[PDB]
Nucleic acid binder design. Sequence first.
DNA 1: ACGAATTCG
DNA 2: ACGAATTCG
Lengths: 249, 255
Amino acid sequence: STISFITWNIDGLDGCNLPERARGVCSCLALYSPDVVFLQEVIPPYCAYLKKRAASYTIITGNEEGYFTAILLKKGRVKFKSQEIIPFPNTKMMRNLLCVNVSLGGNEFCLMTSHLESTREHSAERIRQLKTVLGKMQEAPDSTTVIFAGDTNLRDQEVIKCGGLPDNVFDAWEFLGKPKHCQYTWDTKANNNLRIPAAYKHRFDRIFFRAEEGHLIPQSLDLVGLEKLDCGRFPSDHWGLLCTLNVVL
Amino acid sequence: SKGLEDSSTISFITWNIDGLDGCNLPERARGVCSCLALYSPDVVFLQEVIPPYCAYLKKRAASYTIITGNEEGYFTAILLKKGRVKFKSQEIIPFPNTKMMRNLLCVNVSLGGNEFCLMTSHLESTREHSAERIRQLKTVLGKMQEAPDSTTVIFAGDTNLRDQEVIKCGGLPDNVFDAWEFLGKPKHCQYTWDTKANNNLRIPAAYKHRFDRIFFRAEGHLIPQSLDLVGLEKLDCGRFPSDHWGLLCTLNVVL
DNA sequence: ACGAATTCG
DNA sequence: ACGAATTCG
Ligand SMILES: [Mg+2]
Ligand SMILES: [Mg+2]
Ligand SMILES: [Mg+2]
């Protein structure tokens, strides 16, 4: 019993080349055919595109206006049981926490995504949001496997300020030994989309999990969306993360 | 006049006089000088002095010896009342990472039968430069601690501090006190920069800060007596001498 | 969605 | 020399 997924901030707020870039995202999704896709910065017409292009997935969204997150669940692999949205009462960017309860065969999951408050300036609110996420991860029954995957905008120091990850919550990248090839998910040296004429890189996109001992084992982690499209730009200013995991009973 | 009874007292003004605003500057300098004439402080600590402003001080505050923190741009100064203060030396300590030509100016003097190290600075400005401002504060506090134990150390200047930043510094050292805090945090002189009450910068909003502060090293030998704002009167041009209020402080040196 | 600089109210 | 918003590099 395995589960595979992609998490990706697809920069729907960039209107430039957006249709081509959306098609680019989905060409990448088609190659890997993940069980679950967690998306951030979806906008309404992008969601409308996904409802047709990804009609083979159940699509759950974090809002209906502005920009928002989504979780796509592969029909026939993933059974959708419920969705839950938890607000971030002090967000200035309409951010929230989107959760879905699902099963794959006999295994129950709570899958969660968010786009935490952006920029250095909003560190304090981002930390409060992270605490909300970690709190929610603890609520599921012990028998349920909890996975958060999303755009956290985190700096390592902010996780320390937060108290560090709890003893029963793990970061998939850390678990896999901090591989260098997929460390940075936002990198202005390698990615030209924002036209930032400087080199900055961050591990903004992260995966946290809580599972009974050895019931969830990350197997691989890889960057996706690394190829330029016809327009000479990438699907997004972020790279996506493709993760495969086994559920070991 | 300063007679026998007041011989144990040092009085001073600290004031960022906004020499970077050239508009109405000569009239505003005359306003500052009128205040100095009224209170006749022993020492004046100034920030944002520019070279033309030194000429205005030589004309309208001629009884003060002027010691400056630099020769060009904008800089601090310490003014010493002739006949009261004996000038012994001046020291300038750089702030190697300043982006605003800031530094620490110290003047060693004798006054009223006591040796003093008088210090001023204009610490790095704006919220954005908090980290550098904190580094500079540490330099200042370190220098206050280094002075010979017999000397009385007083810093007065424009610190640009927010209260949270002093905490991040770990707070003032054990033998260093803030004069305003010492006097019980009086409300009348709490804010030294206030855009509701002062319109020189034409900021269309109401913000207020205790940017200008006085620190002293002491045990029981230096006792603040009073702290008051100055420069709260509009001049003929309808503007204040500066965007900051000045602070007038008197301290007693005790056996 | 970087840090630095600048504009706006 | 404010904070927020925007622009610049
Ligand atoms: Mg973005
Ligand atoms: Mg593997
Ligand atoms: Mg100023």
